[PDB]
């Protein structure tokens, strides 16, 4: 009764956010999407035109139920943070209550307290550049949008969450081992995120009895994954399917069912952890 999850970072059905929504929907969790304003209207129109109907089919006995879909920008902590330019920009002008604080307030006002929170977003202006060639501003952009946004989400959402709630984010192994092409300070951002997951786990655990973990996912041909540049993601997938201990296609719903477990009471003694869902690729040193 009333397992409600906010998923921050869905723009289509091709990423981990959607796989997570599907698996949770399967367990009858109510789902609220937080959608970035640059893609929000296109997502809504597609949704309304039934473009996602096939993708919403669970077992053909069940179909996903989505409780709400809200414009959301993890760049802005409160309304006072929004620069006049953004506020007035073509894609933002007609939207409201999309900062982290406002969206938590809106969710609370409409549905009461929630018990599950998903951070499924990242961004970096200079992702295409190697770390050495990343500018101060590009690096800080990657940290701001990909890492600090988690801390802020936690800060504002803990107020609208029940004790024993659970929070997850997504990370990538480039934080711990070198992945050429994962540029722009994304590796730095993921390293910060994994460390912040531990520190937040301490504070949230002690003060709120709330858990936080992160899933280190293997490669998935999402929309963001193309932004990296056959392309970077095509090589990653090919390499993973050839060399992982489990040689099988990694699905967004593989991450989804792990997410679902971490967000449930079944994982109540797990917190502060980086959990690898990557067909075991992370354990390998030397290829065959």
């Amino acid at each position: 009764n009333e397992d409600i999850c906010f998923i921050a970072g869905i723009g289509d059905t091709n990423g981990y956010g959607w796989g997570i929504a599907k698996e949770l929907s399967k367990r009858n969790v109510k789902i609220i999407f937080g959608i970035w304003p640059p893609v929000y209207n296109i997502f809504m129109k597609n949704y309304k035109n039934g473009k996602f109907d096939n993708d919403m089919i669970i077992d053909k006995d069940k179909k996903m139920n989505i409780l709400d879909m809200l414009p959301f920008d993890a760049s802005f902590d409160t309304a006072n943070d929004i620069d006049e330019e953004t506020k007035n920009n073509k894609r933002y002008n007609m939207l409201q209550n999309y900062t982290i604080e406002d969206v938590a307030n809106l969710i609370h006002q409409k549905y009461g307290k929630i018990n599950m929170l998903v951070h499924s977003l990242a961004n970096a202006k200079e992702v295409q550049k190697d770390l050495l060639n990343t500018s101060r501003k590009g690096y800080l952009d990657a940290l701001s949008k990909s890492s600090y946004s988690l801390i802020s989400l936690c800060k504002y959402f803990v107020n609208i969450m029940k004790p024993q709630s659970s929070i997850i984010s997504l990370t990538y192994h480039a934080s711990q081992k070198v992945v050429p092409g994962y540029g722009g300070g994304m590796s730095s951002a993921k390293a910060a995120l994994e460390s912040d997951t531990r520190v937040l786990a301490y504070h949230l655990g002690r003060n709120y009895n709330i858990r936080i973990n992160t899933i280190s996912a293997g490669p998935l041909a999402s929309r963001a994954a193309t932004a990296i540049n056959y392309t970077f993601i095509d090589y990653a997938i090919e390499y993973s399917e050839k060399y992982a201990p489990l040689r099988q296609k990694l699905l967004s719903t593989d991450i989804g069912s792990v997410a679902s477990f971490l967000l449930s009471r079944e994982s109540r003694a797990i917190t502060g952890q980086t959990i690898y869902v990557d067909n075991g690729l992370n354990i390998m040193f030397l290829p065959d």
Copy 2:
């Protein structure tokens, strides 16, 4: 039908039982492997109803135990048992309790299984610090606590379905110093965690079978009381300093095991997963 063999249950106070309870919730059939020295007292307590309250899952269900078999992880095959054991009071009345014999017996009675739990450890010199542990004591720890996992996998893969899943239990003393966790137990756990990776590679590639290990926080089990109030200290420190200040239950480990043993976790393998209320993340007590 799901069937899980759980090697290392002696009573209802350890992690093996909590894992059994949680799997039972999900309608998994459970087979216990019981160390022969305690096999007859276990059967007696069970028959006398000592475990009845511990078997209740809820209003609806009671634990279904498919079978309970003697199992000694010291011995790979029938040929490995020495005379002194053959002659032992608690062994002479039992049979087919080597790792291979148990695999063959389960397969013959019940067919193929799809879940395997290693929940056992031993070290005859656990009360000595590592520096004062003898070669025989150290190798005993590795033999009983680490190699037993490899042997379990070796003999059991033949009786397991593709997409089966295996777990063991470990402890953070492998990675950081726990004074008191002596006799090469820290060594054995480090080997277990590394072996979990290497086995994940061979089992995943050859059989599409997953293997992970759960690094559990402290629980006042029978084996824990043999370390030297060590466990009293560990539990008190964990409950005081862990990010989550709730009592760690065997079923907290059990529900994670159940997930790792299910298809829900089909993309996780070779991993050490911490189920310890977050204690492992702390650097210094606040």
Copy 3:
């Protein structure tokens, strides 16, 4: 002949920068100090008034030789990055060539190419706040000054360094395990720094044959260490001296002699590494 080291982050004789200078000076490496403008004039006056004379004594057979002392602010990559306000500020107005690019240029013009580089600096406006309570701006400040500054230093100094040169920075274990009181995103910054050390090691190793490592140091009662708030550092030191495998006072020159090794040819097969110099405290789980 001509082992020259630039040490970025010395403001007095109480920190790791000074211990590193001493140990290198011991091996006859020439030392150039990069001194932050807020403390630069006070450092120079103290130096000129002989206040550091005792602290410069090596074995009483030898005394430290300092080749140069340059104003340096790791906040600014190039002259074009300096805001008009800073440029005109009381402490900056009378200084020149203190951005990362300008200082590399100046060093090159005066002394030619160098072969050793030390990043011994960190800053975070909100260090006193817990991570959960750190603002976006405070967090980005910590990353900018403590982590990105390393990348930028590398980017500009690789041009004035010889092949087979070596770079080190300093980090702290709070990046990997939770240290309450290490706030403001300093833990996040150190996690980024350790990850960036690997990524830089790849690029610098492959393109320049230059090594980079970081030293994870135990507690030292430096000036910065008081900024954290008996205080945070007093407890850290007390705890380290009581519980480390080696129960002995950790000296800045203990870090210095490790730094010196990492910067020398003796460590030519080590790169991308986080090296712990902390009397072994990091290996402990449970106290006695």
Copy 4:
């Protein structure tokens, strides 16, 4: 005067020799512990001047070797040698080669030492994958490659000065899967790295003695050629993909060992230090 015992030199092509060379540079007196099966061929090659070119440090200096003694890390004390070894062709002509006997002999001839190097490993089933390794094969790997370090420490601390330093060599297969590194060698290295921490605690607190381990990249030593062209592949892959694309030399490991064994590193203990041209940091070949 500094004196270092180096256990595990068989010829001039391994890490033991490179460590000996580098310590010699710093005027450390060197004592070799040589596995009895190869002790007589080593002495013969040495006398015949086979190693003369390898002993040159430079224009100035030649390696000073204080002594060369038979040493078998399989045996803790005289009582541990079985008859079959006593009767063996290559052992019967040698004596005082157990770990305790060597410590006693060195102490009696030369007094206290202050540097100790464990540079040895063995595993009779190295060519089998972990899953197919027998209990006896696995325990042999742990016995010879891991427990030998604990025993070395146990017997040698008595003959060492306070502020002494100990190192061993390990390999990244303990932490990440290297197909080919079989027979429980990966297991033994994981135990070695964990044991390095636990020993650092006991040795640091009780004796103020430091212990670290160097995780080395691949070198075409004698033992390396026994793994199954494995080493040819490892070296080629390392030289192609490591951040530093220079040939890894035994003396690259030797200069790190020398530093860790000196007072320069007085604040480092319980650590695994990677000396591998940075290869360990890479996630996937570019």
